[PDB]
Amino acid sequence: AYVYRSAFSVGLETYVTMPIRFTKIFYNQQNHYDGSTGKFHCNIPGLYYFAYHITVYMKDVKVSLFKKDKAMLFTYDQYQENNVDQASGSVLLHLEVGDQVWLQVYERNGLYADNDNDSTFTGFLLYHDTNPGEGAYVYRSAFSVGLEMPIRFTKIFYNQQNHYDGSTGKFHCNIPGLYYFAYHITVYMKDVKVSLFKKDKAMLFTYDQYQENNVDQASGSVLLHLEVGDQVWLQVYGEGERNGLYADNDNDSTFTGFLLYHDTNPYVYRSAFSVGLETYIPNMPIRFTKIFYNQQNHYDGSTGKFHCNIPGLYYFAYHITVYMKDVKVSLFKKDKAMLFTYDQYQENNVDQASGSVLLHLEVGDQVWLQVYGEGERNGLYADNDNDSTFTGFLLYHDT
Ligand SMILES: [Ca+2]
Ligand SMILES: [Ca+2]
Ligand SMILES: [Ca+2]
Ligand code: NA
Numbered sequence: 001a002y003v004y005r006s007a008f009s010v011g012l013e014t015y016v017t018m019p020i021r022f023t024k025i026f027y028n029q030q031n032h033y034d035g036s037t038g039k040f041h042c043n044i045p046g047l048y049y050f051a052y053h054i055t056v057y058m059k060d061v062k063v064s065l066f067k068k069d070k071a072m073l074f075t076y077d078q079y080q081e082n083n084v085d086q087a088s089g090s091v092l093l094h095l096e097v098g099d100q101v102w103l104q105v106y107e108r109n110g111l112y113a114d115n116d117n118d119s120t121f122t123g124f125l126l127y128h129d130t131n132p133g134e135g136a137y138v139y140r141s142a143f144s145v146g147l148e149m150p151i152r153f154t155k156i157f158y159n160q161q162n163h164y165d166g167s168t169g170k171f172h173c174n175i176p177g178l179y180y181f182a183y184h185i186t187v188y189m190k191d192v193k194v195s196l197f198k199k200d201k202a203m204l205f206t207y208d209q210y211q212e213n214n215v216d217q218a219s220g221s222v223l224l225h226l227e228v229g230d231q232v233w234l235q236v237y238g239e240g241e242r243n244g245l246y247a248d249n250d251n252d253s254t255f256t257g258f259l260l261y262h263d264t265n266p267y268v269y270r271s272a273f274s275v276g277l278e279t280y281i282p283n284m285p286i287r288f289t290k291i292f293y294n295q296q297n298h299y300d301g302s303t304g305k306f307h308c309n310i311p312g313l314y315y316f317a318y319h320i321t322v323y324m325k326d327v328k329v330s331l332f333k334k335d336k337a338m339l340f341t342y343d344q345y346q347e348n349n350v351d352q353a354s355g356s357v358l359l360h361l362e363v364g365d366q367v368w369l370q371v372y373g374e375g376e377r378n379g380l381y382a383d384n385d386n387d388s389t390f391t392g393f394l395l396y397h398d399t
Helices: none
Strands: 007-009 024-027 039-043 045-065 070-077 085-095 102-103 110-112 120-128 142-146 155-158 170-172 179-200 201-208 216-226 231-236 243-246 254-262 272-276 292-293 303-309 312-333 338-343 350-359 366-372 378-381 387-399
Touching: 007 350, 024 350, 045 201, 045 254, 045 338, 070 085, 070 155, 070 179, 085 142, 085 155, 085 179, 085 216, 085 243, 085 254, 085 338, 110 216, 120 312, 120 350, 179 387, 201 216, 201 350, 216 272, 216 292, 216 350, 216 387, 303 387, 338 350
Parallel strands: none
Antiparallel strands: 007 024, 007 120, 039 102, 045 070, 045 085, 045 102, 045 110, 045 120, 142 155, 142 254, 170 231, 179 201, 179 216, 179 231, 179 243, 179 254, 272 292, 272 387, 303 366, 312 338, 312 350, 312 366, 312 378, 312 387
16 A cells, blocks of 8 residues: 655754744655745645644744745744743645645744754645545545634634534544544633543643733643544633633634544554653653553553554654743653753743654654753643643554
8 A cells, every 4th residue: 555655844953033944854754845945845635734833932933834825824922031932833734736835933033942942843744635536545534723612613724524513613523533633722811721522521631821911822632532423622621711712813723633543443554642641750751641542552651651663654742731840851762852842930820831743763763751951840740630741643654
């Protein structure tokens, strides 16, 4: 079976004030990301997932994701002195051969990256368009919606199967399998506390505190196996009306999901894990023990390490609640820290920090998350209704 690959994952090496030219190449094997322009070129029509994560320092940041010269998605994060922030966004977009996609500052150019600080930008082909009707059928169930009881997202980035109901805010599973979900909320005016529901219960929680003159960005993502007829949605969670979700002409709060691996009987290549902290050790892997998904057992709870058992391209994402103390983590691959994520903590201001990257892995490769340096910046937080999560999945197996 031919595998359709087109993916890139890059980072800033310099912060600069125009398309943002990422020049740190995590992955770009098809060479479909052009480093001299910062633009991704579509060579294969289909449904593409894009995600970015920016270190906010010194000055506010506002960026927009462009698809062939139109602003599709906006992400705003205000900076306060002595308070480094983390802003992210993600969305599905269907692309035609020729479409180009990039990121630029919507000044608010507070993007930052140096020798131990990353701002990254990643995209991959999820579903290629199935010529009429050639080769491998593709199982599709996906949605990507934005804000304009379940939270009713009405702005439609993608809903081609209509498995998401815009009048109720609910996604309905029509195809049994492993689903990925992600959200990104701009926090303004009031605190934001949300919860990802599955059927009838809160699976995941994300809290982000709002201080005056400090718009924030909060995100979450998880892997959930679904059976036909059960649904998923995002609901404001708490008892203090933590509903400071925001959106306007050029500010988004989004909710995205997609079938990753469909269920089969006796071939699909599956290697995935999604785990969370159940509370809060220097120079050692952070051990996430709450298990959302770990079907192949490729993630080892007892060591906190992911082991590659199928060579190919992997996507990793994490989301961390920042409380009481600065948080800085490094993503390791095979005893080398690949990616760094820093988020300062200010009193009475819980924060949300995240990163995600594509990494090609071979047999023996281990991936894990570790607190940075001497392990001092360990303000990671989790409890009965606050999450810090680590997720990874096999995207394309080597052929
Ligand atoms: Ca912060
Ligand atoms: Ca902020
Ligand atoms: Ca906050
Ligand atoms: Na944040």
